[PDB]
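Technical appendix A lists one of the benchmark inputs used to test multi-chain prediction within the project. The record comprises four sequence entries:
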Amino acid sequence: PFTEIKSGFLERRSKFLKSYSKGYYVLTPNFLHEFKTADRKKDLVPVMSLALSECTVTEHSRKNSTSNSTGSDAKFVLHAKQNGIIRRGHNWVFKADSYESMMSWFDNLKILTS
Amino acid sequence: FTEIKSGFLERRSKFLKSYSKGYYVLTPNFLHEFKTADRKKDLVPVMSLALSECTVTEHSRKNSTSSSTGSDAKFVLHAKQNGIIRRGHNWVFKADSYESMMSWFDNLKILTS
Amino acid sequence: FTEIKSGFLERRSKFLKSYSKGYYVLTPNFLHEFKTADRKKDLVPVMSLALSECTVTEHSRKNSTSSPNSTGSDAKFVLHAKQNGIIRRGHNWVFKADSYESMMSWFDNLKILTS
Amino acid sequence: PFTEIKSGFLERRSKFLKSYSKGYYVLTPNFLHEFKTADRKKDLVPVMSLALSECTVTEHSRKNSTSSPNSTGSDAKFVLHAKQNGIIRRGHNWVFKADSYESMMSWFDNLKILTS
């Protein structure tokens, strides 16, 4: 009986590779977990687990954000306060499947990282 | 009241690689961002940038080219102290034309003196 | 004769925002860049990256995407410098191979050599 | 009687504005000067003068360098690096774009000898 605040697919940007890779993410009160698939029965080991206690969410796309790309209105930034999966003071960019989906991820993360 | 200039500007995000349009009001003390141009009902700035500790550094030349729109209509606001912007960091704004950009720039230059 | 791998790779320039293709030869000590694949006449490396003080950090995933009309979104890897040399300590170089499988050959070989 | 090693138009990139601006450049043994025009008779005051004594040239495009369609001059860029605070902040870099690979290589080669 897996319990979660939110889960869904997100694309995560690589700063150096300048590309996105899609994964299945699970937000709990303690961690943002990345898994390879949505199958909570057979896919049991997170690819990585980001402790929320030492992350913050800092900025997100506006509904009118433009670039010329996909999901210019659906991105948000997760910032590291301490060394872990992410280096202290560094940032990871995520792309959701819509503005409204992004806002749900952002709002939930913001409350869990206050 | 002592508003110096107001209008829509696009502001670049470094991490999101995108522009977002907002309605800005320039006063002697602040550049204020609002969501809308409704001065009666939209009263709380999204953010208020203290001009006392900002400078305007570069701006597009009339011959500036990109490609993206507004290649001749951008300027840079630089922070001298930690606030909305980290000390030493910069924000990029895009106006609707060179002439409009220069109006913003010239006004900001005097206020940040 | 103790070459481990050789072939063409594109290397990204951060300041020039472009890729340049070169012919690379991987040995136990160095990744060498040459202008051409002519091992008889083209004998002097353009540069020689000491593997002893490099690591390979990230690489593209099979599903990595970049942008329509951009090539090799699934074929890049990152070489990181642990010390000042051709690359400044803490800095990174990005390479693009001709496919995911080719990239993974380069990456796996570099991973062992930089251990 | 204006004496120069090389002169010609170059585009200079702005890091923050992500745009290029074209100017007329004059390379002498002492400086890389920027002017607004090619008229050495009426256009007498440099927009800026970069001391070569404290600059280096560090990298340049290859003949095969590729960026994206449609970009121009992917084979015609070079980087000028500051060793001391002046026009450019110490340790910072300016990117220039010439009108061809061969023109770029002429600029780069001359700058490299003058900044050795």
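Residues 98-111 of chain B form the longest helix (14 residues). Chains B and C do not touch (no CB pair under 8 Å). Comparable benchmark entries are summarised in Table A2.
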